[PDB]
Amino acid sequence: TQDLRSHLVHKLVQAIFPCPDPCALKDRRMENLVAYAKKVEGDMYESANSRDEYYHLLAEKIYKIQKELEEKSQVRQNYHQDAEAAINRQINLELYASYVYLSMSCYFDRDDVALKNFAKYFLHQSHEEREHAEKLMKLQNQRGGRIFLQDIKKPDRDDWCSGLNAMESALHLEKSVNQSLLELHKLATDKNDPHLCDFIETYYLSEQVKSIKELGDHVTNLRKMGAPCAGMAEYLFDKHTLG
Template identity: 50%
Template structure:
C-alpha cells in the first residue's frame, strides 16, 4: 500500500520552470565537482607532482559541492522537490598541462555562470524576487570573481612558461 504525500505547504510563488532550473544547477554543480576532483587527482599523481595545482583544484571541487548543497537546501526551503540526475563524468582524466586544465576550468566556470544568469532571468520573468536575491547574494558575484581569478591564473601560466616557471607558480598555489 502506498501513501500519497500531500504537496509542500511552504511552496509559494515558486514557478515549476524555476524549480527545474534549480535541479539543473544542482546537477551542474556536482558535475563541476567531478571535473575539479579529476583535475586534483591528475596533479596529485607521482608522474605529474604539482601539489599546488592539486590543492587548488581540490579546493574548487569542495566549493562546487558546497554550492550544490546550498541549492539542495534552497529547493527544500522553497517547497520544491530535488530531482537527482545522472552526473556526467569529466570528458577526460588526463589534463595534459596546468595551462590546459586552467583553460578547461575557465570554460566550465563560464558555463556555470551562464546557467546562473539564465536562472536569474527566469526568476525575474516569473517575479520570483526571492530566487533572484538568492542568486545575487550567494552565487553571481562569486562566479564573476572566480572567472577573473582563473583568467589571471591563465595569464600567469603563459607568462612563466614550463619548467622552473610552472614549478614556482605551483609553489605559490601551495600557500
C-alpha cells in the same frame, strides 16, 4: 525480452505508488493497487501496435497517474515548474563541476605531475562547489520544490594535458556556470521570483566572478612565464602562488 518486461513491470509499481504501511493500515490496498496496475498494463499491451508507442503510452499513463498524487508542500508560495527545472539543471551542473574539480585534484597529485599545491587548490574548489550545491539543495527544500537527482556526467577529457589546458577548461566551466546562473536569474525575473534570483545574484555570482578572475590571472601568469612550454614556470607558480 523477458528481463526487460520484468523490469518495466517491476518499476511501475514503485513509480506509481511510493511505499505502503503494514502496521498503520492493512495490506489489501497495495494488492488492489498492483492488481489495477497489472490490469491497465495488460489492457495497454492488448491495444498496442509496435514497441516504442506502447512504452510512450505507458509513460504518459504513469505521468497522468502521478499528476494527482503529488501532495504539494504547505510552504510552497509563488513557484513555477520552470523554476524547479532550472534549479535541477543548476544542481546537475554544480555536481558536474564538482566532479571535474575532483578529477583535476586527483590528476595533479600523481607522480608524473608532482604538484601538491595545485591539487590542494583544486580540492578546495571542489569542496566550495560541493558546499554551494548543498546550499542550493537546502534552499530548494526550504521553498518546497522537489529535487530529482539524476546521473552525474563524467569529464570528456580524462587526461587534462598539463596545467594551462586544465586552467582553460576550468575557466570555460566557470563561464558556463555563470551563464547558467544568468539564465536562471532571467527565468526567475520573467516568472515572478524575486527572492530566488536575488539570492542567486547575491550569494553566488560574487564567488563566480572571483573564481573567473582568479582563473584568468592564473592563465595570464602561465602564458607569460611559459607553461606548458617549460616545467620551470609550473614549478615556480606551484611554489609561489598556490604555495
